[PDB]
Structure formats: structure tokens, C-alpha cells
Design a binder for this molecule. Sequence first.
Ligand code: HEM
Ligand code: FZV
Length: 456
Amino acid sequence: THSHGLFKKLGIPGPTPLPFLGNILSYHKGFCMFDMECHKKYGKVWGFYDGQQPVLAITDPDMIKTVLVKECYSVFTNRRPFGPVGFMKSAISIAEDEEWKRLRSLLSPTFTSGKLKEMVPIIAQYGDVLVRNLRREAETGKPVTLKDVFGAYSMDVITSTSFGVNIDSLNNPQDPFVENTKKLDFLDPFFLSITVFPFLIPILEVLNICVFPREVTNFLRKSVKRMKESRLEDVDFLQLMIDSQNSKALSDLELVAQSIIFIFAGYETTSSVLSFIMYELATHPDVQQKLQEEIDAVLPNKAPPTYDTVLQMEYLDMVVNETLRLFPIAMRLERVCKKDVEINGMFIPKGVVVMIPSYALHRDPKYWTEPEKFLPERFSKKNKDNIDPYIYTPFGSGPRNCIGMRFALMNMKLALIRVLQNFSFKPCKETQIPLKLSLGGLLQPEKPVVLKVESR
Ligand code: HEM
Ligand SMILES: CC(C)(C)OC(=O)N[C@H](CS[C@H](Cc1ccccc1)C(=O)NCCc1cccnc1)Cc1ccccc1
């Protein structure tokens, strides 16, 4: 509470913090509601406290460009630490300063479009698996829980595109590989405690207690070392990383850490976003029909999608983009200010976490007409030019943006094309309309999305 005078000293408005807790009791309706309320009450900048940690929210696009792009290497290089991580210190998304810059360099060629284009046939084959599993539920007119069927698909693409492991996870839900990979919210009892007692992280570190379950990581560390020495010697991210350390080059533990970070990144996020898209499509049947029409036009006779035909589909892009406006699953972007700086006329002291409230800026009425409405036309080739890339930031911006952005969009778009070539999706009576968001620390629905699936 001796850090609680900072924003008052700088003349920055904000909610008044409680001793020890700072402002965290205000998270009782989730990050997103608190961000919106603060933006409304206070304006273009505000300040609050995760316990003793000061967080400065910013909403000026010039200033957001300074933090995310212009001054990224110099000042704003790292996100805030969040819990004991053990050897996952070395994952690209956790690493800092020159170690991150090194790993970002080492893994960037892995995510080029050319490498992605070679991944498309592997991503395509489990679209086919996705359809047959869905068709089994559509012929037995039982409502479908999207998270399970899409989770199984996302998991299927990951195991294949990252290790070559080919599993029908939905029907082998309990293969040892699928078990570890699925398993284990910054507003759960643990992480709030860490925010009130962030002195306790080094405690857990010397104790080898890790927020990554130690059994999953132990399983994958040894799984990788088997794969590595079965390929060595006798198309996936592991090969791409194995070829990279065939040179400063990627250590062996370092390689495992990135493998682990890739698996989750796209397990729950791809799965989650595909469900938000199928919700919107089901409650906006005209948007759905217009997409089936575009897909049939570009790929007649249920022609298999290809890398090039996917980038041909403009309405598909508009649907994806608009969904990520309403549900940017990151919610906020964050960088720690490593040096006293003054950017766009505002002094920022060292150690402040600077925060871009994406969810709140994606639903700002001052940049978006009817911002709560699902309106893909916002992203039409005509109107797309009028959208500020520092207000709409579903993948971040700048040198620390989502390295997997192009893979994710291609992964999800192949997912939707195949599924819409063969099915229409319709609300049930058990479908939650309007969808309510979870009051927790994740951007996800209050209730899981359930929809009726009919065969075309
Ligand atoms: C719909 C899917 C996804 C969305 C919306 C998304 C969004 C984001 C966002 C908002 C960030 C923070 C960017 C920033 O701080 O400016 C991020 C970081 C990151 N994402 Fe994604 N992401 C997605 C999928 C993926 C996938 C499939 C991968 C596959 C490897 C991935 C890997 C990463 C990595 C490694 C980082 C950290 C980048 C760094 O620290 O250098 N993400 N993502
Ligand atoms: C989004 C937020 C900050 C509100 O709560 C978080 O969950 N904490 C993020 C870590 S998320 C997840 C956690 C994890 C899981 C397994 C191993 C290590 C870490 C993770 O693997 N993260 C990196 C890849 C990723 C995640 C989501 C989207 N794209 C890529 C901090 C963070 C959040 C989003 C992007 C980058 C970092």
C-alpha cells in the first residue's frame, strides 16, 4: 500500500485500491467487465493495482503503437511474470529480453507461409476426421457440444503438426498421448493468491512446484526425446526445430519447452474460437448461408480446400475477423516497462505493467457502430481500410505479436470450410441465446455452446 500512491502522484485517474488487495476485488465480474467499466468511467488512460503491482491501461492508438512496436526492444520487451514455471522459463512466450529475441529469431522461420503451406495437407486430413465424427452425431439427431468436437479436432491438428502423432482423439480420448496433452484461469484461487502474495513465486520455484503439471511435462520431455532419437536417425514443428538446432542454436530442453507451449496455444484457443464462430453462424443463419455459398463457389462439388483457395474466400475472412472482434480470447495485451520513459507526452515509471484492454477496445462504441452486434460487413474490403490496427488487435501487434497467427487462421479456416461443405448448424432449445460470457478469468461462454447439426 506504499506503491498505492503512484497513480495519484502522476495525476492518472483510477479506482481507489484496498490495502494488499489493490483493486482485485473488482475482478468479480471478470477482466472484461472491469476493463469496460474503467474505460467508461475514466477515459483514455487509467491506473489500477493487481495487489501491489501498478497497471496502467492505455487506449490511444498512437501510444499503443509506441508500446507495442516503436519501443518494444528498448523498453517494453516482456510480459508480466505470473507464477512458478520451472524449466518453462525457456518457452518463447515466457522468456525475456535477449533470450526471447534469440528464441523468436530461432522459431520465426518455422511459422513462414511456405512452411504453413506444407502443413495444409496434414491439417486437411483431420478435417476429414472431424466430418465423419460430426456425421455420426448428425445421423443420430442429438445436439452437439462444440467444445468437445472442436477440441478433438484442434488436438488432432496439434499432435500431427507438432510431432507426427496421428490420433483420432475424439474416439481415442484416452490414449496416453492425448491424456497428458489436454490437461490443465488467472482469477482462480491460486493466481489471485499469487497476485496478493507474489513473494511466494520464488518459494514455489525452489520447491519445483510448477503451474505446468509436472507429470504432463515429464511425459512430453521424454516423449520428445524418444521421437528425436527415432527420427535421428532413420514436416512438423519438431522436425523444423530439430533441423534448426542443426546449426546459439536451440538447446534440447529449450526445444521441449517450445513444443509444450505450441500445444496449448492452439489447443484451447483454436477450439474456443471455432466455437464462438459456430455460435454466431448458427444464430445468424444468413451469414451461414452466405458462407456456404462462397465455399461452394470456390470449391464446387465439395472440392477439398487448398492453401490458395482458403485465401481466396473473402467472406470467410470477414466472419473470422468479426468473431475475434467480439471474442479476443487474450482480452488484454501486456508489457512491463523496464525503464523510466515518456511516450506521447506521458511519463511512465519503471516497473509499471502497461496494458491494452483489447476486449474493451473491440467493443468501444467510439470506434465501432453497434459494437455488440455480429456484423461481418465491418471487415469488407471496402470498410476494412477504416479499422485501426491498434484498436483491433486479436493477435497482438509488433515484434511480440502472436507468432502463430497465420497458422491459427489457416487451421481454423480449413476447419470451417470442410464442416460447412457438409453441415448446417442450427440452435437448439438448449442453446444459450444470447450467449453469456464466463465471469471467470477466461474469455469463454458461461455455458458450453450446444447446437443442432444437419447433413447437407
Ligand atoms: C485463434 C488463435 C489465436 C489467437 C487469437 C492468438 C492470440 C495471441 C495474442 C493476442 C498474443 C499476444 C500478442 C502480443 O502480446 O501482442 C499471442 C501470443 C503468442 N501466440 Fe498466439 N493466438 C492464437 C493462436 C496461436 C497458435 C496456434 C500458436 C501456435 C504456436 C500461437 C503461439 C503464440 C506464441 C508463441 C505467442 C507469444 C509470442 C512471443 O512471446 O514472442 N498462438 N497470441
Ligand atoms: C490470456 C491471459 C493473460 C488473460 O491468461 C493466460 O492464459 N496467460 C497467458 C499464458 S496462456 C497459456 C498458458 C500456458 C499454458 C501451457 C504452457 C505455458 C503457458 C499459453 O500457452 N500461452 C502462450 C501461447 C498462447 C496462448 C494463448 C494464445 N496464443 C498463444 C499469457 C499469454 C496469453 C496469450 C498469448 C501469449 C501469452
